[PDB]
């Protein structure tokens, strides 16, 4: 029953998911002047050359591009992470207007959208077990701003017509997520949570400093998706972001000076 509307949105989630008011909730505002450089943080290792995308799904909250995570084919390692984390899916959060849409903010600045590449720690065997652990997931967050087109995003944009409504999926093979990355892998990192129910506190967040640029046409196509199912009254899938939550007893660390 949860969603992003007036009557079921982020301010309501705590009633079904009390952890919404927990000690390590996400997203957060990244105060760039207060984040501390940690010279011991290793470079990120993003190894996506053998990635196998399978399917794209409108789940009624966003759309997920899903990967074969039954082998170490696309993995994230290094940075703040111990061990190997396997890519299971990516998705986005976006706004109704270019001035909002991201979940994380940077010195209170909101971006037009935010990409989340979701990975789970292989020491826990599968995603369902991983989300029950404090170090179960690593989500790589990348901001989107509107300007020039991102060529590597276009194959995603062009399949969206086929998954307009909740519960629709389409084959989506041979998609290379490397085409969604910015040049720099400089990042901030902190311990947090899933930003949708069940809001589990299982995520090491790694948020890249450098945004990617996407075109106005590309983000306009995100905004044509529907939260509703086929045959139901049309509700545009926009503003599917949770606002910044209290940092509480956490320090955001930076990989860069
Ligand atoms: C209906 O139940 C489910 O879908 C549970 N299975 C499942 N599978 C994936 Cl790939 N992600 C998720 N949840 C999920 C993953 C990532 C995030 S986010 N926005 O913190 O990156 C928020 C929610 N659940
Ligand atoms: Zn997300």
């Amino acid at each position: 029953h949860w969603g992003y509307g007036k009557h079921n949105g982020p301010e309501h989630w705590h009633k079904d998911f009390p952890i919404a008011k927990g000690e390590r909730q996400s997203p957060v505002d990244i105060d760039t002047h207060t984040a501390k450089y940690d010279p011991s943080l290793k470079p990120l290792s993003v190894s996506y050359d053998q990635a196998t995308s399978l399917r794209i799904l409108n789940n009624g909250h966003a759309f997920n591009v899903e990967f074969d995570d039954s082998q170490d084919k696309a993995v994230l390692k290094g940075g703040p992470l111990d061990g190997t984390y396997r890519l299971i899916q990516f998705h986005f959060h976006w706004g109704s207007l270019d001035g909002q849409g991201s979940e994380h903010t940077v010195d209170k600045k909101k971006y037009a959208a935010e990409l989340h590449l979701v990975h789970w720690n292989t020491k826990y065997g599968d995603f369902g077990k991983a989300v029950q652990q404090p170090d179960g997931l690593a989500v790589l967050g990348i901001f989107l701003k509107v300007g020039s087109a991102k060529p590597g995003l276009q194959k995603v944009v062009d399949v969206l017509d086929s998954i307009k409504t909740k519960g629709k999926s389409a084959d989506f093979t041979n998609f290379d997520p490397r085409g969604l990355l910015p040049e720099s892998l400089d990042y901030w990192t902190y311990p947090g949570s899933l930003t949708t129910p069940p809001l589990l506190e299982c995520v090491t967040w790694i948020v890249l400093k450098e945004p990617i640029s996407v075109s106005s046409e590309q983000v306009l196509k995100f905004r044509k998706l529907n939260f509703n199912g086929e045959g139901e009254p049309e509700e545009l899938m926009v503003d599917n972001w949770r606002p910044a939550q209290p940092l509480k007893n956490r320090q955001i660390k930076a990989s860069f000076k």
Side-chain angles (χ1 to χ4, degrees):
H1 199 242
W2 71 268
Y4 295 95
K6 175 183 173 193
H7 303 289
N8 67 354
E11 302 315 314
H12 292 273
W13 293 351
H14 71 100
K15 293 176 274 170
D16 280 318
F17 305 96
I19 204 176
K21 293 176 183 290
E23 299 300 315
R24 55 174 281 187
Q25 287 292 289
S26 293
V28 297
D29 180 56
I30 302 170
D31 190 83
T32 65
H33 288 293
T34 293
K36 193 189 164 62
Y37 172 66
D38 187 343
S40 76
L41 283 170
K42 297 178 176 179
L44 269 186
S45 172
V46 182
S47 298
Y48 288 171
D49 49 283
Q50 297 295 121
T52 293
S53 64
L54 295 172
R55 195 178 72 142
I56 189 171
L57 169 71
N58 180 333
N59 62 22
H61 308 294
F63 64 85
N64 292 347
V65 174
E66 301 166 350
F67 290 80
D68 173 17
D69 66 346
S70 71
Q71 283 189 90
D72 280 343
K73 282 180 171 186
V75 302
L76 183 67
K77 299 178 188 171
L81 306 173
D82 292 331
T84 297
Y85 290 68
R86 276 186 201 164
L87 180 67
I88 175 166
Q89 52 106 328
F90 70 78
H91 61 273
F92 304 81
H93 306 260
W94 62 92
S96 55
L97 302 153
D98 293 352
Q100 64 196 51
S102 68
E103 297 208 299
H104 294 89
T105 53
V106 177
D107 295 333
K108 301 297 181 79
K109 176 192 172 70
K110 295 176 172 86
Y111 286 86
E114 185 174 332
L115 167 58
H116 289 162
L117 294 125
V118 182
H119 311 74
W120 55 272
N121 193 328
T122 61
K123 76 185 185 177
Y124 299 125
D126 67 21
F127 178 89
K129 275 286 194 294
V131 298
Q132 301 177 62
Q133 316 305 323
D135 61 347
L137 294 193
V139 184
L140 180 60
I142 302 180
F143 295 118
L144 282 59
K145 67 184 182 180
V146 173
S148 299
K150 191 69 166 179
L153 179 60
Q154 192 59 34
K155 285 180 184 181
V156 174
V157 165
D158 281 333
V159 77
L160 298 183
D161 280 329
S162 73
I163 57 152
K164 185 177 176 181
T165 48
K166 180 174 55 178
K168 295 288 193 184
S169 66
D171 295 319
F172 200 68
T173 54
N174 303 107
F175 179 80
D176 188 345
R178 293 176 294 186
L180 298 176
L181 304 175
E183 285 178 7
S184 184
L185 295 181
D186 289 346
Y187 64 85
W188 296 284
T189 184
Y190 74 98
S193 73
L194 301 179
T195 67
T196 74
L199 298 168
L200 295 170
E201 294 180 332
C202 60
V203 181
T204 297
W205 278 95
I206 301 169
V207 177
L208 298 190
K209 169 180 50 68
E210 184 177 358
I212 59 168
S213 291
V214 304
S215 65
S216 55
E217 292 86 4
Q218 289 179 320
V219 69
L220 283 165
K221 290 184 182 193
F222 285 10
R223 301 180 184 136
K224 293 180 68 175
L225 288 166
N226 281 186
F227 285 126
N228 55 283
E230 183 179 11
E232 298 174 355
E234 188 163 17
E235 310 172 270
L236 294 183
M237 183 180 282
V238 295
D239 294 318
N240 59 346
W241 52 276
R242 188 192 196 191
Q245 298 302 304
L247 190 60
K248 294 188 172 174
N249 185 221
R250 295 178 286 181
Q251 288 180 349
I252 300 179
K253 298 175 181 173
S255 77
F256 60 96
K257 296 179 183 178

